[PDB]
């Protein structure tokens, strides 16, 4: 039923690993008093009160799973 067209000939381009450049420490903790990316209740919204809830949350001031994208080799254009 699906189409999702198609691709090119069976010949793939090159890939290199140089991950020492990607190894750098950028310290960014997560504050819960600032509420940095925490799940909302799905259908139970409140107003002006403090409420306890059991769900899925991370810890406070954590490090993360740091990755970063970059650009490839080039010369001129």
């Amino acid at each position: 039923v699906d189409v999702g067209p198609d691709s090119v000939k069976s010949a793939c381009i090159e890939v290199d690993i140089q991950q020492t450049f990607f190894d750098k420490t950028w310290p960014r903790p997560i504050d819960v008093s600032k509420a940095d990316g925490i799940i909302y209740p799905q259908g139970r919204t409140y107003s002006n009160i403090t409420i306890t809830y059991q769900g899925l949350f991370p810890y406070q001031g954590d490090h993360g799973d740091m990755y970063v994208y970059s650009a490839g080799h080039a010369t001129g254009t």
Binding site: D2, G4, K9, S10, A11, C12, Y67, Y69
Partner: protein
């Protein structure tokens, strides 16, 4: 970022771990992040160079 999700781990054609079997999910941002297309399909590795 573009994500892939499944439930199997295997070694590649060169023995590097990371093969996923059966129906698996891939989501990808494209067009300077305008499109966020996702698809739960069968991936087929190519066998060329």
């Amino acid at each position: 970022p573009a994500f892939m999700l499944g439930s199997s781990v295997g070694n590649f054609s060169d023995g590097k771990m990371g093969r996923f079997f059966n129906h698996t999910l891939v989501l990808l941002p494209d067009g300077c992040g305008t499109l966020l297309r996702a698809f739960y399909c069968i991936l087929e590795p190519r066998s060329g160079n």
